[PDB]
């Protein structure tokens, strides 16, 4: 049912800078997802070029923001290429080990973090945000699986048997208890508006 993992010793150190270093710019969390699933919708889009089947699970290009009060969630859901279990494991398709290497090492000459992106590891930054964070994602080669973290240095994967997705990717951010405000609707609209406004995808922020 539910496999349990480490986390390779450089993005555990990774997760716990991004959630103990005083950095009031949080915001920006929603920038690197949001440029994640672009990337990923990237992916599809090259791959089905030359092979249209790939689109078979879905011809919608997209990127949907669900904030949820009741649960205290913001769910980031994509129709990009996906992960397979291979690479959920492996820090979810990234190279954060060298990644964070290098992002560490531009932190140790004037970087800041909001510039975690440029180094490939920008999904951890939903750590500035999410005390604990689900992924749902489904690849057109393999399963769907869950994959899940509160950080303390393990994940675990299991097989998500839930809804099925078809193809795509489901960030799903259990938020810090005081960062409720990434659940307004004007909020998440002034932050989509300054940092993702000209990505190449119809980003629909949902309705509660
Ligand atoms: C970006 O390509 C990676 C494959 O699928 C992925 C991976 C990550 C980290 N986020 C999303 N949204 N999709
Ligand atoms: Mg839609």
Redesign the pocket.
């Known amino acids: 049912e539910v496999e349990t993992f480490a986390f390779q010793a450089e993005i555990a150190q990774l997760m716990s800078l991004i959630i103990n270093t005083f950095y009031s710019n949080k915001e920006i969390f929603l920038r690197e997802?949001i440029s994640?699933?672009s990337?990923?919708l990237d992916?599809i889009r090259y791959e089905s070029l030359t092979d249209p089947s790939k689109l078979d699970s879905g011809k919608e290009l997209h990127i949907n923001l669900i904030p949820n009060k009741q649960d205290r969630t913001l769910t980031?859901v994509?129709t990009?290429?996906?992960?397979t279990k291979a690479?959920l494991i492996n820090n979810?398709?990234?190279i954060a080990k060298s990644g964070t290497k290098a992002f560490m090492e531009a932190l140790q000459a004037g970087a800041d973090i909001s510039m975690i992106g440029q180094f490939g590891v920008g999904?951890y930054s939903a750590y500035l945000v999410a005390e604990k964070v689900t992924?749902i994602?489904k690849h057109n080669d393999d399963e769907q699986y869950a994959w899940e973290s509160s950080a303390g240095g393990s994940f675990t994967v299991r097989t998500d048997t839930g809804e099925p997705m078809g193809r795509?990717?489901k960030?799903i951010l259990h938020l810090k208890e005081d960062q409720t405000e990434y659940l307004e609707e004007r909020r998440i609209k002034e932050i989509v508006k300054k940092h993702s406004q000209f990505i190449g995808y119809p980003i629909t922020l949902f309705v509660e």
């Open positions: 997802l994640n699933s990337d990923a992916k980031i994509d990009g290429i996906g992960m690479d979810l398709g990234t999904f992924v994602t795509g990717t960030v």
